[PDB]
């Protein structure tokens, strides 16, 4: 319920952020995924490509300014008994196109958690075209902590990671 739409970020917090992704549902499962809006320009969801469960929550059409949005999945009997998986990418006021990327580490204890974001410059729609940028274009890797970079369209992004349980990895771009 409380998902699907965050604040500016300057009143995130985990303690609450915890909760907030069990108001879903009474589940063993927990994922956060979303991007804090703040560079100035409204933006446009398109697609959402998705292997998880199925959906549980409405994705945000259009983000306000200085604002942010989460989402949600299910794992059921998809690619996982427990978490959610999707990438999908938002339209940017500049005719870019950001691409999140989130998972559920938390059945893969054989490697650490991987991530990645990028912003696919003009139009891409969420497919396996978004996913294979992720995958194979260039995966990365974190283990608890901040990291930030420019990369390379006029913004720059950082991305954070967190391991164990009530943990998940977000991405925040800004100017």
Same mark, same amino acid.
């Given at each position: 319920?409380? =998902?699907?739409?965050?604040?500016?970020?300057?009143?995130?917090?985990?303690?609450?952020?915890? &909760?907030?992704? /069990? /108001?879903?549902?009474?589940?063993?499962?927990?994922?956060?995924?979303?991007?804090?809006?703040?560079?100035?320009?409204?933006?446009? =969801?398109?697609?959402?490509?998705? @292997?998880?469960?199925?959906?549980?929550?409405?994705?945000?059409?259009?983000?306000?300014?200085?604002?942010?949005?989460? !989402?949600?999945?299910? &794992?059921?009997?998809?690619?996982?008994?427990?978490?959610?998986?999707?990438?999908?990418?938002? !339209?940017?006021?500049?005719?870019?196109?950001?691409?999140?990327?989130?998972?559920?580490?938390?059945?893969?204890?054989?490697?650490?958690?991987?991530?990645?974001?990028?912003?696919?410059? #003009?139009? @891409? @729609?969420?497919?396996?075209?978004?996913?294979?940028?992720? !995958? !194979? #274009?260039?995966?990365?890797?974190?283990?608890?902590?901040?990291?930030?970079?420019?990369? #390379?369209?006029?913004?720059?992004?950082?991305?954070?990671?967190?391991?164990?349980?009530?943990?998940?990895?977000?991405? &925040?771009?800004? @100017?």
């Amino acid at each position: 319920a409380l =998902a699907g739409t965050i604040i500016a970020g300057a009143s995130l917090t985990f303690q609450v952020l915890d &909760k907030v992704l /069990e /108001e879903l549902g009474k589940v063993s499962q927990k994922i956060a995924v979303g991007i804090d809006n703040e560079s100035g320009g409204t933006w446009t =969801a398109l697609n959402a490509y998705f @292997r998880s469960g199925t959906t549980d929550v409405i994705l945000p059409e259009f983000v306000p300014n200085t604002k942010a949005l989460l !989402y949600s999945g299910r &794992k059921d009997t998809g690619p996982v008994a427990t978490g959610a998986v999707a990438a999908f990418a938002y !339209y940017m006021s500049s005719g870019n196109t950001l691409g999140v990327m989130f998972s559920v580490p938390f059945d893969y204890n054989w490697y650490s958690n991987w991530w990645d974001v990028k912003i696919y410059s #003009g139009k @891409r @729609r969420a497919d396996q075209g978004m996913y294979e940028d992720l !995958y !194979y #274009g260039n995966p990365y890797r974190g283990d608890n902590g901040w990291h930030e970079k420019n990369l #390379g369209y006029g913004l720059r992004m950082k991305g954070i990671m967190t391991s164990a349980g009530e943990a998940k990895m977000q991405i &925040k771009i800004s @100017r």
